[PDB]
Structure formats: structure tokens, C-alpha cells
Amino acid sequence: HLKPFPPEFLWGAASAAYQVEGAWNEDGKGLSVWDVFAKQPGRTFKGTNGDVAVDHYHRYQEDVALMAEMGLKAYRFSVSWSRVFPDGNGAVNEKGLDFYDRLIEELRNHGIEPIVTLYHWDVPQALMDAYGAWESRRIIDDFDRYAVTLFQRFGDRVKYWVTLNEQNIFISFGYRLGLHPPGVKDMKRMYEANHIANLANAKVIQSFRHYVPDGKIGPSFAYSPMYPYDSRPENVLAFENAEEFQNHWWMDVYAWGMYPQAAWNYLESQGLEPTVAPGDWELLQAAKPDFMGVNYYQTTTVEHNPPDGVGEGVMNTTGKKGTSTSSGIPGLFKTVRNPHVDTTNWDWAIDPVGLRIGLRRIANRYQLPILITENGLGEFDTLEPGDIVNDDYRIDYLRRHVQEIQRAITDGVDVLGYCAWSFTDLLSALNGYQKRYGFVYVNRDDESEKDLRRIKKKSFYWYQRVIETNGAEL
Amino acid sequence: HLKPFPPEFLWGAASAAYQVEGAWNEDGKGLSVWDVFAKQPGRTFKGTNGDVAVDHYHRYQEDVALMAEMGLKAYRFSVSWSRVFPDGNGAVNEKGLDFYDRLIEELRNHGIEPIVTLYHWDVPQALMDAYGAWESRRIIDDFDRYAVTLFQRFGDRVKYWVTLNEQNIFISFGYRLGLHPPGVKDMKRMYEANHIANLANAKVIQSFRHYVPDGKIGPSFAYSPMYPYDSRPENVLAFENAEEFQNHWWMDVYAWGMYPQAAWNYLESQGLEPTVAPGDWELLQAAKPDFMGVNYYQTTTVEHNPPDGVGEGVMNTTGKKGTSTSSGIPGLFKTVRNPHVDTTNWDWAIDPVGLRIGLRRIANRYQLPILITENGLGEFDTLEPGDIVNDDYRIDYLRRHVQEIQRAITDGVDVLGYCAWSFTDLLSALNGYQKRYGFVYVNRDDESEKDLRRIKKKSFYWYQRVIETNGAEL
Ligand SMILES: O=P(O)(O)OC[C@H]1O[C@@H](O[C@H]2[C@H](O)[C@@H](O)[C@H](O)O[C@@H]2CO)[C@H](O)[C@@H](O)[C@@H]1O
Ligand SMILES: O=P(O)(O)OC[C@H]1O[C@@H](O[C@H]2[C@H](O)[C@@H](O)[C@H](O)O[C@@H]2CO)[C@H](O)[C@@H](O)[C@@H]1O
């Protein structure tokens, strides 16, 4: 017997400010690092950027009406820091807060629970110029001031808050792979910026307990659970290292306020461990979250990697299947194709059982409730005559993942909700507009901006029925 | 660059009372459950039992002299409860305490650290008769009385203490497989007795903090780290279940005082979860150990097991290689031979890297120091003319495991010591005398006690050199 989804289950969908809003220079908004980064040639797919995105800043009423038609119980969005503090610090921009006030009111007036995400990668460029943004401890108080501003203005109406969305992605991509701003390839700087982000996460959670005492808050982690390739002891050891280096390194800090020791010792041997100040451990250990946010898309299978072995591999940002290659850390592990699952056209593994596994691992290690803040299928969609988008492939992916959530709940995992990525089509930061995730098709591609009109996909009606039956009919 | 073994690393060897002592009915000793069980027809290999064993009770001076010749830093032995309390909970048998006093004095006069193990499976039969031994809460205070008796008598001379040795074995074999006393095959009773054993462990650790404030104490867990067979999601999920049900089920309670939730829910769903009394969780959570004791011999590889699938399999107690078959829990997991490691003639996997993995897992999950309380190769030995025993196979096994301990220490695992099983040959409870583990061969077999003479094997001199070089020459 499978348990039902709890009556309070938050059936959601999600977006991110830079990928959805547009209005990049309106109403006093400052430049974010992504405004500046995406305009540099070669940084994004076909030069696509968020100047207009899908224009949700001007069309939020239409989009929320579509959410209400679908019956969404929750909508997770991120607030653009540079709309609220165009400088990062300094004077608050009332016009920026007013947009999110109007958005939250539109959501509440349609019975949709807002889930406010504080940070999705868009620190104001002014803070990068002033002091290197996440590489300086000055960002802890500046981020805290920004968060407290939002807590005071919206805490009366927003129960659920996410602090840093995918810190492991914006840190690793920004400082190890050089694919996100600041475009750095320096592991020492990566772990320093990462430690400061950990302190910022902890500081704002502490502030949240003061300003929103009955709210619920947590970071959201981009979780690819690791698998060993097989039972060869060296491959299981590679899995132990991969899970600790890629996943425990973040979630142990979020849950326990401690870095895992083997990873710490390895980094220390390379001279890469972060600088620790007196009080750091105390602050990190005291900032217990109400839930672990989880962005899940795929598992990763790993195998042994000799000391002279694989480092950085090829990443698929074109949609040409089979173009990704193995990446790893010499001496510890490297990725390998999992022969037992299929992949998307961007070589992302399709592994719904892996979501049950990841939920089980988090509950087993940390005993935390989980809010699934992102999950979805990025794929090409075709607009057929009659405003028909037959995205059965997206329905299939979503169905199987939701089925596995129900099994994890039956296993005893406390899952608060499920936010599909994404509500409407939106900009993929590095993959352009053709890698679509929405329930709602948006009419543009990478060449032609067209009119951005909204068209309900077949998956829209499928998820409408999911919510209508509280997940009993998948 | 491997880090050295720490200077005071406890190079040890180990035994257990019923398996080594003999003198089963001397000097006032009462019956243990193993005295009675092993004399039931069909319960042990060739009807072997511990009436005489290798007669360490009378020959302990000779054996300790051999330990001193080897240069052992530590000797781990177990105290026979039925020598100290012949009826389990009445008046103390001073002759019983006096034997362990003489033993401890002999060890300390030769510079060997005693490591006292309170319980290696030999609860007095009188407590089984009176109330069913571990199945009754009465055993908590009776075990506590016995433990405090030893703490008061020996706490001045014994720093390192082990509480329950392989609770997961004596409980699961006693109550699920029916292969140990009391011969029960009932999962509900198994988890009830297990819960009471957990409370007994917690109670005596609490007592230890009062009576031996400067000592170190921990339980010892029979740890077979689980591997998934491959990266098929269903097999990784089976590994998640196997690791939780077989390993976290015990070690989470020892380290955190809490059972893992997914396993608890499954047992609850079958009406198998233990009865919990007011105060149980507070006691279990309060009894933090100084170390996790680890008895390691092999890893276990698992795969998906359907609801109609494999239950109990064939267990090899004969030394005829290849006679074991898969065991598991229908719906959760089943074992499968690991094609990437060799096995002994008793079908135990030889996986030294698995020891590094297991040590890494305990440090990663619990941040506890580890005392390796047992590790060894059980194999046939041949006595060659001139009293020579060339057990290069045992040297190879021990060398490779000690090498992996050093890698684990380099990774940052705090390993306090390493006790090889066993110092002399001794009785295997279910496999007789031919499944030998000793550094010291004992001249007897399953048919005759012969003269019980002690003969140093080649591995004796190998380990002597290991100790002399503090593990720098393996
Ligand atoms: O738009 P994408 O690249 O297809 O990503 C989908 C959403 O997932 C998050 O980012 C990805 C990241 O880009 C990957 O490189 C990494 O491997 O995993 C995370 C998935 O957690 C972002 O939350 C979002 O902006 C993406 O749209
Ligand atoms: O004498 P054995 O059966 O060869 O075992 C040697 C030592 O290992 C522990 O028992 C085994 C147990 O008998 C196995 O059936 C089980 O699978 O695992 C443990 C291994 O930890 C005994 O507790 C140990 O003290 C034996 O003397």
C-alpha cells in the first residue's frame, strides 16, 4: 500500500528572476553579474540573455492567471537582488520591492502559496566591482541586510523561504569551471567563496528566526546522488569520495555546520581548504534549517580515476545527444555513463528511482524534511497547429518522478512539496530558449524573439489533474 | 604520502571466553547458554563445543608469554559472565573474578594493555531459564550489575572496555536465524530482544562514566559494509536498504540513540517494530561511546530482491568452497557474489579495500574514533614436520588489511588500534576448530584435543615485525 500525499502537500512550479523577468534596466534596477556576464561574447548559447527573457515582469498577471487555471498550490520564484538594492548595498529601491509585493498579492489573491527564493545567482555587479562579491566577507552583512529587508516586507505573507538556490552550482561554475560569473578557474578561490556563502546562509537563517519566527526556511541544494559503477572495491571507494566531495561537502554544512573530514583533509593537502575565522563554526552549527531544499534532475555514476586521469570533460550545451564526456578529480573519481538509464538530448540521466534514493539518503543522514524546489525535463518542443504542444516526453518524466516521491513518502521521507521546473518556458542560462521546461510554452526561440505569447502544453493539463487529485491520479 | 601509524597505536590480538577458555565447569562456573546449546545434537560443526576449547583457562601463562614474545601492545579478551555470576544475577563467584585478575596481572606484568569485552554471547543459562535472557527488560539491571562488578574490580588497571561484541550477530542469529541460542526464528522477537540489548548497552556506558571516569568504552559492531551490484537504480536502492537495515540499524543507535526512519517504518508496516517504554530514547541518546568498535571480515554485495524473492540461504559451515547461497529480505535486497573479489573456503569475501571503505563510512557518518576489535583470515592450516606452519595466505590477508587501515588514517579516520582475530587458534562457534585464525597454532582438531601444544605460525613472526616497526614494515 502506497501512502497518499499529505493533504497539505505543496504542488508547485518554479522560476528564477534572471531567467524569467526581463525588464533588466527598468524601475531603477541595477546591473547583476548575469546582465554583464551574458553580454560578453561566447558566454551563453547564441548570445542569449535576460534583457527580456519571457517578460514575466510585465506579464506576471497573465502568468498567475495560468497558474490559477492549473490549480497551482505553490509558486516558487526568486527575488532579484539588484531590483531591491541596485548597488547591492546602499539605498533600497521601493519600486523593486513593489514588483514583488504586487506579485505576492496576485499569488495570494488566487490562493497560491508564494515560496520566496532569496538568491538565484544574480548578485549586483556593483558588489563584484566593490569587493569581489562572494569572495569577501563583506557580502555576509550586505546579503543579510537584503534578506532582512525582504523578511520585514513579506514575512507576514510568505511562510516558505529558500536562501541560496544551488550554491554548489553558482560557486563551482563561477569559480572552478569559469562558466558563470565571475568566470574564474581557481579551486582555492572557489572554496573561499564557498565558505563565505556558507556563512551568509547561516547569518540569514539566524535573522529569519528573529523576523519571521513562524516561517520555514532552508537552502536548496543541486543534488545529483552518486552511484558506483559496480561492486569493484575501487569503484565503491570512488563513489564514497564522489558523494562526500560533491554532496556532503554542501549538505553536511547546511545540516550539521561541519565539513566532512576526508574531503577537508584532501583539500588541506592541496592547500585548498578555506580560511576559517573565530566564530565561523559556531555560526554555521547554529543555523539549523527547517528543511533541505532539493533541486533534482539526475543521478551521476562514477568510477575509479587514477592520479594522472580525467579532469574536466566536455559539457553539452547544444542539445546534440552524446556530446558530453567524463569529468572527474584525478585520484578520487570520474563520471561514467550509466548503462541502465536513458539520457535527455543534453545527456542528463533520466533516473526517477534516483530521486527516491536521494530523498532516502537525505532523510537517512540528516532526518530533515525535504522541499523539492526544482525537478523537470529540459527538451525541444514543437508548436503544432491548433496551439497543441504534445510534450508526452515531459509528462512521462514528471509522472515517474512524482511516483517515486510517493514511494519515498511511503518509505517515511517527509516531503513538504514538489516544485516542477518550470512553470512557463524560460531562459536557460547556458542553454538558450530551445531547452524548454515549462508547462506553458512561450513563443520565441534563440533567433526570433516573436511575441512571447503563452500556450498551454499537454503537460499543463496533466499536472492540473495531478493537483486536482492530490497526486492520486498520475 | 601515507601518514605513519600514531605512536601509541594499539597493535592487538583478540579472543573470546567460550571459544578459548575451556574449564567449562570448574572453579564454580555456571552454565552459559552456549554450554547448553552446543550440546544439543546438530547445533554445531561435528558437535564441537567449548568444554576444553584450547584450555586457555589453565594455560594462560604460556599464552601471555607468547604474546610478550610477539610484543603485542594490547590483548582483547572477553569475561565469562557465568564464571562471575554462576546463576547470572545472584552471589558473586570470587574464583571467577580471581581468574581474570590473574590474567590481567599477567598481561600488565608483560607490558600488554588489557582490553576487556563484557559480553561475547555467553549469557548464563540461569537467566535464559528465569526470564528469557535478552528478551526481557530484567537483563538490563542484571547486565549492569555484572558490568559494575567488573568496573569496580578492574577499572584501576583496564582503560579500554568493550560492552556488547557483535550484538547484531548474537541477536539476529539467536532470534532470526535460530543458529545461536535460544534458537528462535521470529523477527518480532528479534527486534524486541535487540531493543533491550540496546538499552543494556546504554545503561552500562552510563555506569561506566561513574565508575571508570578515565576509561574508554564502546560497543563492537560486526560490520560488513554493503555494495550495490552495479549502477542499475534498483540495485543502488537495494544497497540503500541493505546498508540501513544491516548496518545503520545498529550503529545509528550506538552513535545517535535513534533508529533509522525508513527501516523503522518498514518494520512498523509489518508489525515488527520493538516496544518502546517511556525514557528509552533519553537513555539511548545519553550513552555516547568513546569509539565505535568494528569487527571487520568482508563486504557484502547486494541486488534487487522482489517481494516474492530470496529469503534465507545456505550458510557454509563446512569449509567446502562455493556452498553458500544468496540470502536477503524479500522486497528490499538480496546478497550476490561480488565478481571483483576472491573468497575464502568458507565463502567470506576477501576485500581489504572494503575495510578502508567501512572505516571511511563510520567517520563520515558519526565522526567517531574506531577501534578495530576483530579482523582475520579463517582458513585451514597444515602443521608441517618440525612444527612449522607456513600461513602465507593469512599474512597476505592481514598485510593488505593493515595497509588499508593506514590509507584510512591518511584520509583522516581516527583509528585507535587493530586487534587481529585471533591470538591463538580457538573454537569457531559454528565452524569447529579447523577454521583457524591464530598467530599461534594449537595442536588439536575436531576429533581430538591431542596435547593442545602451541606452535608459532609464520604470521606470528610477520606480525611481530609489524609491531616492532609500528606498521612501517608490512
Ligand atoms: O537551464 P539548465 O542548464 O538546463 O538547468 C536546469 C535548471 O537547473 C539549475 O541549474 C542546473 C545547472 O545549470 C547544471 O549545470 C547543474 O548540473 O545542475 C543544476 C540543476 O540543479 C538551475 O536552478 C536553473 O537555473 C536551471 O534552469
Ligand atoms: O568463527 P567464525 O564463524 O569464522 O567468525 C569469526 C569471528 O567473527 C564473528 O562472527 C562472524 C559470524 O560468526 C558470522 O556468521 C557473521 O556473518 O559475521 C561475524 C563476523 O564479524 C564472531 O563474533 C567473532 O567474534 C568470531 O570469533
Short mmCIF file of N, CA and C and ligand atoms in Angstrom, two decimals, chain A residues 16 19 120-121 165-166 169 173 180 222-223 295-298 315 348 374 421 426-431 435 437, ligand 1:
data_model
loop_
_atom_site.label_atom_id
_atom_site.label_comp_id
_atom_site.label_asym_id
_atom_site.label_seq_id
_atom_site.Cartn_x
_atom_site.Cartn_y
_atom_site.Cartn_z
N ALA A 16 13.12 31.52 -11.94
CA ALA A 16 14.22 32.29 -11.38
C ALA A 16 14.21 33.65 -12.06
N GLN A 19 16.15 34.44 -15.37
CA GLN A 19 15.70 33.60 -16.47
C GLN A 19 14.28 33.92 -16.93
N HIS A 120 19.21 33.55 -6.58
CA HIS A 120 19.47 32.67 -7.71
C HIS A 120 20.50 33.34 -8.63
N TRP A 121 21.71 33.52 -8.10
CA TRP A 121 22.97 33.69 -8.85
C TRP A 121 23.21 35.12 -9.31
N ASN A 165 19.89 29.35 -3.71
CA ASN A 165 19.49 28.30 -4.64
C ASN A 165 20.72 27.77 -5.37
N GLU A 166 21.02 26.50 -5.15
CA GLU A 166 22.14 25.82 -5.82
C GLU A 166 23.47 26.55 -5.64
N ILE A 169 26.25 25.03 -7.47
CA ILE A 169 26.36 25.33 -8.90
C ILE A 169 26.93 26.72 -9.12
N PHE A 173 30.49 26.61 -10.78
CA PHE A 173 30.50 27.11 -12.15
C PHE A 173 31.14 28.49 -12.22
N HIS A 180 30.06 30.50 -15.19
CA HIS A 180 29.19 31.50 -14.60
C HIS A 180 30.06 32.66 -14.16
N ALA A 222 21.60 21.61 -5.28
CA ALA A 222 21.53 20.89 -6.54
C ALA A 222 22.13 19.51 -6.33
N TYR A 223 21.26 18.50 -6.17
CA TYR A 223 21.63 17.17 -5.69
C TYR A 223 21.61 16.18 -6.85
N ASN A 295 17.02 20.51 -5.47
CA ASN A 295 16.88 20.57 -6.92
C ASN A 295 17.41 19.25 -7.48
N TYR A 296 16.52 18.43 -8.03
CA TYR A 296 16.92 17.13 -8.55
C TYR A 296 16.60 17.03 -10.03
N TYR A 297 17.57 16.55 -10.80
CA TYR A 297 17.36 16.25 -12.21
C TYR A 297 17.91 14.89 -12.62
N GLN A 298 19.00 14.44 -12.01
CA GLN A 298 19.67 13.24 -12.49
C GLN A 298 20.59 12.71 -11.41
N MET A 315 31.02 19.46 -21.75
CA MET A 315 29.65 19.63 -21.30
C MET A 315 28.75 19.99 -22.47
N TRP A 348 21.55 14.48 -19.87
CA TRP A 348 21.17 14.36 -18.48
C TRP A 348 20.48 13.02 -18.26
N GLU A 374 13.04 22.07 -7.34
CA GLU A 374 13.20 22.00 -8.78
C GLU A 374 13.23 20.55 -9.20
N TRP A 421 10.18 22.39 -12.33
CA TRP A 421 10.86 23.37 -13.18
C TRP A 421 10.46 23.10 -14.62
N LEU A 426 11.38 29.34 -20.03
CA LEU A 426 12.19 30.48 -19.63
C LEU A 426 13.59 30.32 -20.19
N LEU A 427 14.44 31.30 -19.92
CA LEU A 427 15.80 31.25 -20.43
C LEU A 427 16.59 30.22 -19.66
N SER A 428 17.24 29.30 -20.36
CA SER A 428 18.28 28.50 -19.71
C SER A 428 19.57 29.31 -19.76
N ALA A 429 20.16 29.57 -18.59
CA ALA A 429 21.30 30.48 -18.52
C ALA A 429 22.37 30.15 -19.54
N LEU A 430 22.70 28.87 -19.71
CA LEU A 430 23.74 28.45 -20.64
C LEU A 430 23.24 27.68 -21.84
N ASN A 431 21.95 27.36 -21.91
CA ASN A 431 21.44 26.54 -23.00
C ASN A 431 20.43 27.26 -23.88
N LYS A 435 15.95 24.73 -24.94
CA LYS A 435 15.89 23.72 -23.88
C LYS A 435 14.78 24.12 -22.93
N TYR A 437 11.49 23.82 -20.31
CA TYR A 437 10.97 23.07 -19.18
C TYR A 437 9.52 23.38 -18.82
O1 LIG C 1 18.79 25.52 -17.64
P1 LIG C 1 19.55 24.18 -17.32
O2 LIG C 1 21.06 24.34 -17.50
O3 LIG C 1 19.01 23.08 -18.19
O4 LIG C 1 19.30 23.79 -15.73
C1 LIG C 1 18.00 23.47 -15.35
C2 LIG C 1 17.80 24.24 -14.07
O5 LIG C 1 18.69 23.60 -13.07
C3 LIG C 1 19.62 24.56 -12.34
O6 LIG C 1 20.90 24.54 -12.87
C4 LIG C 1 21.49 23.29 -13.14
C5 LIG C 1 22.84 23.59 -13.68
O7 LIG C 1 22.73 24.55 -14.83
C6 LIG C 1 23.55 22.41 -14.08
O8 LIG C 1 24.88 22.78 -14.68
C7 LIG C 1 23.83 21.52 -12.90
O9 LIG C 1 24.41 20.33 -13.33
O10 LIG C 1 22.58 21.18 -12.19
C8 LIG C 1 21.62 22.30 -11.89
C9 LIG C 1 20.46 21.54 -11.63
O11 LIG C 1 20.20 21.53 -10.22
C10 LIG C 1 19.08 25.98 -12.17
O12 LIG C 1 18.29 26.03 -10.95
C11 LIG C 1 18.15 26.53 -13.20
O13 LIG C 1 18.59 27.89 -13.50
C12 LIG C 1 18.16 25.70 -14.41
O14 LIG C 1 17.16 26.23 -15.31
#
